[PDB]
Design an enzyme around this catalytic site. Structure first.
Site, PDB file in Angstrom:
ATOM      1  N   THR A  46       0.847  -1.235   0.000  1.00  0.00           N
ATOM      2  CA  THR A  46       0.000   0.000   0.000  1.00  0.00           C
ATOM      3  C   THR A  46       0.863   1.258   0.000  1.00  0.00           C
ATOM      4  OG1 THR A  46      -1.921  -1.005   1.096  1.00  0.00           O
ATOM      5  CG2 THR A  46      -1.674   1.388   1.328  1.00  0.00           C
ATOM      6  N   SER A  47       0.466   2.231  -0.811  1.00  0.00           N
ATOM      7  CA  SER A  47       1.108   3.537  -0.835  1.00  0.00           C
ATOM      8  C   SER A  47       0.025   4.588  -0.721  1.00  0.00           C
ATOM      9  CB  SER A  47       1.897   3.731  -2.127  1.00  0.00           C
ATOM     10  OG  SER A  47       2.911   2.748  -2.244  1.00  0.00           O
ATOM     11  N   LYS A  91      -8.926   2.963  -1.407  1.00  0.00           N
ATOM     12  CA  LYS A  91      -8.349   3.119  -0.073  1.00  0.00           C
ATOM     13  C   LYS A  91      -8.609   4.506   0.505  1.00  0.00           C
ATOM     14  CE  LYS A  91      -4.681  -0.098  -1.310  1.00  0.00           C
ATOM     15  NZ  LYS A  91      -3.218  -0.356  -1.357  1.00  0.00           N
ATOM     16  N   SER A 118       3.447   0.462   3.000  1.00  0.00           N
ATOM     17  CA  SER A 118       4.715  -0.191   2.693  1.00  0.00           C
ATOM     18  C   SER A 118       5.526   0.538   1.618  1.00  0.00           C
ATOM     19  CB  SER A 118       4.463  -1.636   2.261  1.00  0.00           C
ATOM     20  OG  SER A 118       3.518  -1.700   1.203  1.00  0.00           O
TER      21      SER A 118
END
Ligand SMILES: [Mg+2]
Ligand SMILES: [Mg+2]
Ligand SMILES: [Mg+2]
Ligand SMILES: [Mg+2]
Lengths: 232, 195, 226, 196, 212, 204, 222, 195, 196
Positions: free
Chosen positions: D1-2, D33, D129
């Protein structure tokens, strides 16, 4: 006993009427880090064999050197090194399969899954798998890692059994391989868009395609997707 | 505790139970009676974890005696054994289960029949002509399988029981210091004081 | 288990295989994995089979009461919210992985939900041990504005990919089609591509082959009069 | 995930990739998200999908009930409710949440709530991450009071790099713009951001 | 598994069951648990099947080499010790063996050695090894006499395995009988436990607990 | 240690033409030690039959529980419970112990008294229903039973033919399992007569 | 940690007739829930009228078969082209297997052929070399499904003659090669229905005095 | 193995050793002689791990017998005990140590003195008036500490040994099936066949 | 540790921080991580200090003996010797080495050898714990055929960011320039690079 460090993902392959196709992406992953983006994981041996390797890259480079040495060695005191006594796909595989099993038997494996694709002297298609355990098997379609779960189902829809092979052209086979690579790019978190593809044909020989890209991707439908349930 | 045997003959049930109490390194006692009278015609022998055996046995005894007074009536051996099984079946899913295996030897005055029930700490009940808990059956059952008859007299039952104890004394590594033997019949419960 | 859900023009279709297994052993060869939460809200379950059945019926029961209380036809988002909050509370110990699909006054809906309580929205979804085989087919052939017939075809093809390629999946394809302004049509054993061939031999025994010790009539009737 | 949120002149913009992985398998390549807990208070979620969804739903409930009684909540208030859930249930949660919102009095605000349940008010925040790979880039390229177009480019370029290096990140780049003018959703596809 | 061997007036009786199990799964009911080392020596199989088979066959080879070199029958003492010394070298490596080396020579008479994979070597009159050993001991101990006839001794060995086969879940299939004399062993047949049980129940009046 | 294989035992159920059959072995053991050869695993509540394999204490407990519940059912409903209804009751009862389950493999068999339709069903230890048309198996030799049933079974067997099929399925499955055997019982169930047969088998 | 072993599934079956022997095996090769190959031969003609299969972990299986085939070759070299009898092969395989007693070939080996009297012979091995001549032996994944069926239909276990009611057993009459093949096919069809690792194809090698013959049959592919 | 006792009296050394051999569940033998004669006037009893006990004892015996032949001379008990200790001290740091505890009872013909040496598997040697290995000392030493005298006769030594065995038979949980008793004096080694 | 090597027009430059930690304690704040294995073949070391020193010393020995027999070794040859040691002893080593060198025929070359003992020839390479934070920045800012001054700035800015975010990195930024002109050492202090 070790653990893989820098790793390559799926190698996929299938047989068609006049030969075999094999493909693998150009990524060298370092865990979840997509570290190296220009790694060639298909290694040709002569003009009749391509060895596709997944798993540990350091072991891949070692195997690459073994194959290079195998060609050198075969040429020694061999006037027919480029003719009747050239390396066959079956010779190359059996050698690798011996090494892989010997290494696992010393509890020090080459952490790889390997697919040897090629065409024999008599024109027969060769396609066989070997991995870190020394396990070997053959099938009209072969794939490693994620490819086993996602590519094989798609490739088996083209060649479901032995009798489908003569009915499958190189265009249909390559199309199926390329689509599978796209599907893997959608769904494998350790894949890349860039890949290599090799065709070994009994008539046109070895065609090695570099710098291929996954194209014709569907993403537009993402714009309509909102929230995770109740959000508008 | 260690060896508890039971044999149901023609007109009585005989329970044999070892006398030794061992706490690890030393044999602390060689005259321990591993049994409780639940009612005039019902006897229960027991073996298992230290403390839990007597605690469970006395708890059951109290409950059966309470029932006897409330109703002015002696529960059948079958009824007592079912009560005991439920208590153990309840116990096995408790916070800390009773680790107690029992044999219930009773004479049913209504049916005029001896009855032997074997129940383990899980609440596994079986009615048997002869039974045991732990390793006791491994040594003795081959002898009981051979010699046992349903029409045996009490004296013949005792003789077959002696042969079982002799085999135990020969092949068992542990010294269980002999057995106390008790007979349950129509006249109630009595102890064989020479065995 | 292979389960898929596919959105189309005027509704949603859900499909599943019919093999239930105990380890490597096939317990039931024609299992029903398509469950009804309400008349027009259906779901398919992977994971612990009794957790998928139990959680469906519980939410289905509460959905029915809710429908009666509010005098309104149940909504997929309600089933979803109730499922996820129940599953989240049990922190994944209820091993229910579901694809929930349906139609309601708001429209047609397709969701996935996993044992820990996370949910996802999509036009096409797959679940179970044959999900990767199924998703390969869905990713190859899915397009926007599918017709009813195309969606049923795509869904069943995705299940077939699981049947043939996944050892956890097999036997038949069940389908349920939920179209807006229509009754949901449950198509039990929509495909049957795995009928066993006739055996080489009949194993019917001669009568009196088995040795018998005792015979007796079992009294299943109640205590009789007179 | 960014994920990231960036304040700028006219308010704040939230950004996120769309990849959700189970190990190396991409379970969802078009995940949203960016979540709405109030009209102009949104959040970016990282960590356990079950946990962050459960938390977000509870916050949305709390802010809805707050609004009915006391009117529109501040972004700070929303962050405080997030923090209360994350901090008090730290033993049983794996959630890293960025809260972004637009007031008219306070304008664009960003609060990051990492694993422990601490709160940090920042001009911009990055998490997930993939964020590890863009600490250098974001620190060098962030400016205060950027324009809308500059902030969109900054987030696009940043998440492009996060996606490039992180296998757990990928898919489309989603963005939600929060200003006085309202709420605007943006989406950017691989063919656009990969050539940057 | 249940194996026994006992010394008596007429030599040695060796009796074994036939069952092999992998967990609860009955792999075989036709396992040969008496290893014919040579025409004069017998060994019993318990613990590891391969370990017993392999090393007691190997023992036969060593016995043959001994008599070629020494021009004399190997003693049961010497034969058993070759085996026990061998397994003792492997101690710790995980060999599994519990066997009775049985023989009848001039100098020794009927002799039985219990040999075991942790290096134990015991001479004795009665040995019983296996999961059902305790059941067989009961019947043996209560009925054993030195002055048993060959006929009665054979039955006693058969009956003792039956007792084990009945009660022990991991013993059964069939009973193999051997009688070891000075001039060599004599095989006394394979006896299906299923048929043997009912036969013994009726003729003997035993197993009244079981309905037949 | 594994609770489902301490005591051992098997149950099998089959459907036939206007009939059902349910059968079980008689063994109860403590691992290797055989303890009882009279431990029947089939029970009945009215005309509905229930076989239960697994941990013997739970087998007994569940029989007593379902006797309890079917007795109250009858008093309130004023009729005997049916196989379809009872199946749901078993499932419900097992699942209510979801995180502390009875270590059992129950099997329901019976004929619906109103429709006359033969019915069988199986459950895992927490209540998942397997409603097979052909046969249901359970116990420590379930693999062996699956193998026997799959080859021996054919649909629409007459009661006396079904007896032979189910008997041979049980017997030969039990003989390849250390923890099953020591006797066997077969129930042949028709709409208003049930016959119970004890089989002769090897006692090892 | 590196696990040198794996499980490639598969099921094999050896049956000894009066003057013939069959060794059958499915052609499916698997790991976990995936199919590696729908046709990967598992039963091999090893020369001297001996057929062999080493079922379980396919790498050890292939290694063992390869080393046995090699042993046959060197037996000929060393002993004036003498035919390796089935009993001699069996003893030789024990030594191959026990040679790795402390790092075993993770396989269940079965060989089939004719003995020196021309009668059908099947030998069965455990992973470390314990072996037995047998009449009937299934190996691998679905062995537990197949053996009870064979006990009942080959050896007529629990079958008695009608009218006698348990007093007279059904007599053990000899089966033909056609009869055995029927039982083999039904064994694998049933195993395919109830076991997930069994399917795709069935290959049977039949051994007679005339030599080794092959038969192939399709199995369900789900 | 289990109980091995030793007592050095005026003119002899007496070694008592249990007869039981237990392999887990069953007592396989009740007449086992846990001793080897190393030389005409030197006896060694032993206990420890199965197999290793006899292997070690016979190995020592062979070595002492070899020395006896080579030199035509019997080594003193002290010399034999030192040889044995070194073998065990060497063994304890080996790949797989001998798990064997021994008592060496010898009569020194040069000094005309009985001598008892106690050596454990580590190579811990002590010369004692009386000794034991395992738990045997825990039960018996309080009796030996009380009654022992250095001028005891062989008969008095045997009587004190009987009292020790009786205490063992009372308080020990294991049945060791009695003891074989052997006397080592100037005339050599002999076994007391009634004990 | 933060280390990198960058090829440019006139050759190659190696860069490194100077922090060596034992847990959270800085055991050496002025470490020299740029090591000479031959006149114009150097390396950057990361991982076990004992391992990388031992390896480097052995390589230096090998290249010295190579030179005595066969003349100046290529950078590729040096990388191969590093790889041989790292690959063959992978079980007992924790070493991540970047090899950089200047030939006249080949000019500037960079080879990275990560944990497994694989070799990768690259235009530039980054490694060490601090490298994670500058993947985004370095990828965005690297150009081929930069000038000496541009490459020094690129390395200085990159390692500045690595140091800023990584606690295991810090101290001075050391650099070694490899060209035809010779070997130049550079050093940059905190007061310089922290204000960038
Ligand atoms: Mg990515
Ligand atoms: Mg048995
Ligand atoms: Mg059995
Ligand atoms: Mg299958």
């Amino acid at each position: 006993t070790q653990q893989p460090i820098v790793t390559g993902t799926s190698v996929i392959s299938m047989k068609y009427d006049n030969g075999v196709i094999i493909a693998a992406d150009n990524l060298g992953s370092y865990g979840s880090l997509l570290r190296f983006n220009g790694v060639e994981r298909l290694i040709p041996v002569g003009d009749n064999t391509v060895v596709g390797i997944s798993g540990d890259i350091s072991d891949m480079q070692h195997i690459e050197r073994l194959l290079k040495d195998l060609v050198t060695e075969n040429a020694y005191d061999n006037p027919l090194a480029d003719a009747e006594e050239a390396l066959e796909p079956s010779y190359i595989f059996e050698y690798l399969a011996t090494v892989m099993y010997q290494r696992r038997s010393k509890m020090n494996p080459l952490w790889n899954a390997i697919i040897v694709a090629g065409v024999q002297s008599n024109g027969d298609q060769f396609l066989r798998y070997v991995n870190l355990l020394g396990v070997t098997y053959s099938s009209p379609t072969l794939a490693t890692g994620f490819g086993a779960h996602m590519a094989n189902p798609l490739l088996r829809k083209v060649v479901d059994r032995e009798s489908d092979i003569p009915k499958t052209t190189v265009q249909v086979a390559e199309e199926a391989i390329v689509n599978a690579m796209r599907v893997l790019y959608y769904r494998d978190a350790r894949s890349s868009r860039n890949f290599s593809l090799a065709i070994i044909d009994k008539n046109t020989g070895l065609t090695f395609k570099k710098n291929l890209q996954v194209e014709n991707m569907k993403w537009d439908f993402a714009k309509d997707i909102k929230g995770y349930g109740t959000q508008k | 505790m260690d060896i508890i045997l039971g044999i149901r003959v023609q007109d009585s049930v005989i329970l044999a139970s070892s006398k030794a109490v061992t706490r690890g390194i030393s044999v602390l006692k060689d005259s321990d009676d591993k049994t409780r009278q639940l009612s005039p015609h019902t006897l229960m022998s027991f073996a298992g974890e230290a403390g839990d055996t007597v605690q469970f046995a006395e708890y059951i005894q109290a409950n059966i005696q309470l029932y006897s007074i409330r109703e002015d009536y002696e529960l059948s051996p079958q009824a007592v054994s079912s009560f005991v099984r439920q208590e153990l079946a309840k116990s096995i899913r408790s916070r800390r289960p009773y680790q107690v295996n029992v044999l219930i030897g009773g004479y049913d005055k209504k049916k005029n029949k001896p009855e032997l029930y074997q129940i383990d700490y899980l609440g596994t009940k079986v009615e048997l002509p002869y039974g045991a808990h732990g390793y006791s059956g491994f040594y003795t059952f081959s002898l009981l399988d051979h010699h046992y008859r349903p029409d045996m007299t009490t004296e013949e039952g005792l003789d077959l029981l002696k042969l079982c104890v002799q085999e135990l004394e020969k092949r068992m590594p542990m010294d269980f210091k002999g057995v106390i033997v008790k007979i349950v019949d129509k006249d109630g419960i009595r102890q064989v004081d020479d065995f | 288990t292979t389960i898929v859900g596919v959105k189309f023009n005027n509704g949603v279709v859900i499909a599943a295989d019919t093999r239930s297994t105990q380890g490597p052993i096939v317990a039931d060869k024609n299992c029903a994995k398509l469950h009804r939460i309400s008349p027009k809200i259906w779901c398919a379950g992977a994971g612990t089979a009794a957790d998928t059945e139990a959680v469906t019926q519980l939410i289905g029961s509460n959905i029915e009461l809710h429908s009666l209380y509010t005098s309104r036809e149940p909504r997929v988002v309600s089933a979803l919210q109730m499922l996820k909050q129940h599953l989240f509370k049990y922190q994944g110990h209820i091993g229910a992985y579901l694809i929930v699909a349906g139609v309601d006054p708001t429209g047609s809906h397709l969701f996935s939900i996993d044992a820990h309580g996370s949910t996802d929205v999509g036009y096409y979804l797959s679940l179970g041990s044959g999900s990767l085989a199924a998703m390969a087919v869905l990713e190859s052939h899915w397009k926007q504005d599918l017709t009813k017939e195309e969606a049923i075809k795509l869904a069943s093809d995705a299940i077939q990919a699981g049947i043939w390629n996944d050892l956890g999946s097999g036997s038949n394809v069940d389908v349920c089609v939920m179209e807006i302004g229509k009754d949901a049509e449950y198509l039990r054993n929509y495909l049957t591509p795995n009928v066993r061939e006739e055996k080489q031999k009949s194993y019917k025994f001669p009568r009196g082959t088995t040795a018998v010790l005792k015979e007796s009539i079992v009294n299943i009737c109640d205590i009789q009069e007179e | 995930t960014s994920i990231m949120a960036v304040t700028f002149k006219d308010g704040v913009i939230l950004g996120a990739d769309s990849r959700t992985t189970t190990g190396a398998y991409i379970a969802n390549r078009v995940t949203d998200k960016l979540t709405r807990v109030h009209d102009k208070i949104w959040c970016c979620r990282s960590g356990s999908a079950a946990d962050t969804q459960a938390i977000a739903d509870i916050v949305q409930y709390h802010l809805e009930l707050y609004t009915s009684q006391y009117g529109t909540p501040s972004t700070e208030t929303a962050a405080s409710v997030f923090k209360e859930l994350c901090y008090e249930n730290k033993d049983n949660l794996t959630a890293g949440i960025i809260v972004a919102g637009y007031d008219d009095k306070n304008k664009g605000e960003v609060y990051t709530i990492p694993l422990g349940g601490s709160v940090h008010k920042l001009p911009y925040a990055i998490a997930g991450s993939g964020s590890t790979f863009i600490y250098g880039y974001c620190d060098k390229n962030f400016r205060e009071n950027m324009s809308k177009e500059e902030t969109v480019d900054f987030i696009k370029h940043s998440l492009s790099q996060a996606i490039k290096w992180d296998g757990s990140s990928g898919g489309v780049i989603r963005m939600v713009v929060l200003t006085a003018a309202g709420v605007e959703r943006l989406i950017f596809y691989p063919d656009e951001y990969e050539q940057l | 598994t249940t194996t026994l061997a006992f010394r008596f007036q007429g030599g040695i009786i060796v009796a074994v069951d036939s069952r092999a199990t992998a967990g609860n799964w009955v792999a075989s009911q036709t396992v040969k648990k008496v290893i014919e080392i040579n025409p004069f020596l017998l060994g019993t199989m318990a613990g590891g099947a391969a370990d017993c088979q392999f090393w007691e066959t190997w023992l036969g080879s060593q016995c043959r080499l001994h008599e070629l070199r020494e021009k004399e029958r190997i003693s049961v003492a010497a034969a058993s010790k070759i085996l026990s010394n061998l397994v003792y070298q492997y101690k710790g490596a995980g060999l599994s063996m519990g066997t009775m080396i049985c023989g009848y020579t001039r100098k020794e008479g009927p002799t039985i050695y219990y040999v075991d994979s942790d290096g134990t070597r015991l001479k004795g009159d009665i040995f019983c090894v296996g999961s059902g050993q305790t059941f067989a001991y009961g019947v043996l101990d209560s009925n054993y006499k030195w002055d048993l006839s060959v006929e009665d001794a054979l039955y006693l060995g058969k009956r003792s395995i039956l007792a084990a086969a009945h009660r022990d879940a991991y013993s059964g299939g069939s009973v193999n009988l051997y009688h070891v004399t000075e001039d060599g062993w004599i095989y006394h047949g394979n006896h299906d436990v299923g048929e043997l049980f009912w036969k013994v129940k009726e003729e003997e009046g035993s197993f009244n607990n079981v309905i037949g | 240690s594994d609770p489902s294989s301490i005591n051992g035992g098997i149950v099998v159920a089959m459907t036939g033409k206007d009939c059902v059959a349910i059968a079980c072995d008689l063994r109860l053991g403590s691992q290797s030690l055989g303890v009882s050869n009279k431990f029947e695993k089939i029970f009945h509540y009215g005309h509905v039959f229930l076989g239960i394999t697994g941990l013997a204490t739970d087998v007994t407990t569940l029989n007593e529980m379902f006797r309890y519940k079917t007795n109250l059912y009858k008093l309130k409903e004023e009729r005997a419970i049916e196989p379809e209804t009872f199946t749901q009751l078993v499932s419900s009862s097992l699942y209510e112990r979801r995180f502390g389950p009875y270590f059992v493999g129950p099997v329901v068999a019976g004929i619906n008294s109103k429709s006359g339709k033969p019915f069988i069903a199986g459950f895992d230890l927490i209540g998942c229903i397997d409603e097979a048309k052909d046969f249901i198996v359970s116990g420590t030799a379930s693999d062996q039973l699956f193998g026997m049933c799959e080859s021996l079974y054919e649909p629409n067997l007459e009661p006396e033919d079904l007896f032979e099929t189910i008997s041979q399925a049980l017997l030969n499955a039990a003989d390849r399992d250390a923890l099953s055997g020591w006797g066997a019982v077969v129930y042949i169930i028709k709409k208003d007569e049930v016959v119970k047969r004890y089989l002769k088998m090897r006692q090892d | 940690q590196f696990n040198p072993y794996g499980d490639n599934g598969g099921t094999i079956l050896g049956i000894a007739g009066e003057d013939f022997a069959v060794l059958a095996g499915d052609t499916r090769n698997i790991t976990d829930y995936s199919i590696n190959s729908r046709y990967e031969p598992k039963v091999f003609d090893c020369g001297d009228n001996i057929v062999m299969s080493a079922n379980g972990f396919a790498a050890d299986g292939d290694a063992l078969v390869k080393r046995f085939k090699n042993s046959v070759k060197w037996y000929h070299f060393d002993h004036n082209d003498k035919k390796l009898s089935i009993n001699s092969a069996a003893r030789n395989i024990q030594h191959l297997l026990y040679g790795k007693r402390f790092f075993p070939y993770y396989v269940h080996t079965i060989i089939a052929g004719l003995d020196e009297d021309g009668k059908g012979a099947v030998y069965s091995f455990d992973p470390v070399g314990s072996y037995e001549r047998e009449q009937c032996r299934a190996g691998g994944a679905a062995a537990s499904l197949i053996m009870p069926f064979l006990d009942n239909q080959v050896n007529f276990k629990n079958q008695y003659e009608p009218g006698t009611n348990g007093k007279v057993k059904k007599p053990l009459k000899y089966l033909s090669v056609e009869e055995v093949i029927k039982l083999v096919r039904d064994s694998f069809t049933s195993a395919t229905e109830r076991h997930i690792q069994v399917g795709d194809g069935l290959e049977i090698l039949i051994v007679t005095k005339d030599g080794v013959r092959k038969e192939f049959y399709e199995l369900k592919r789900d």
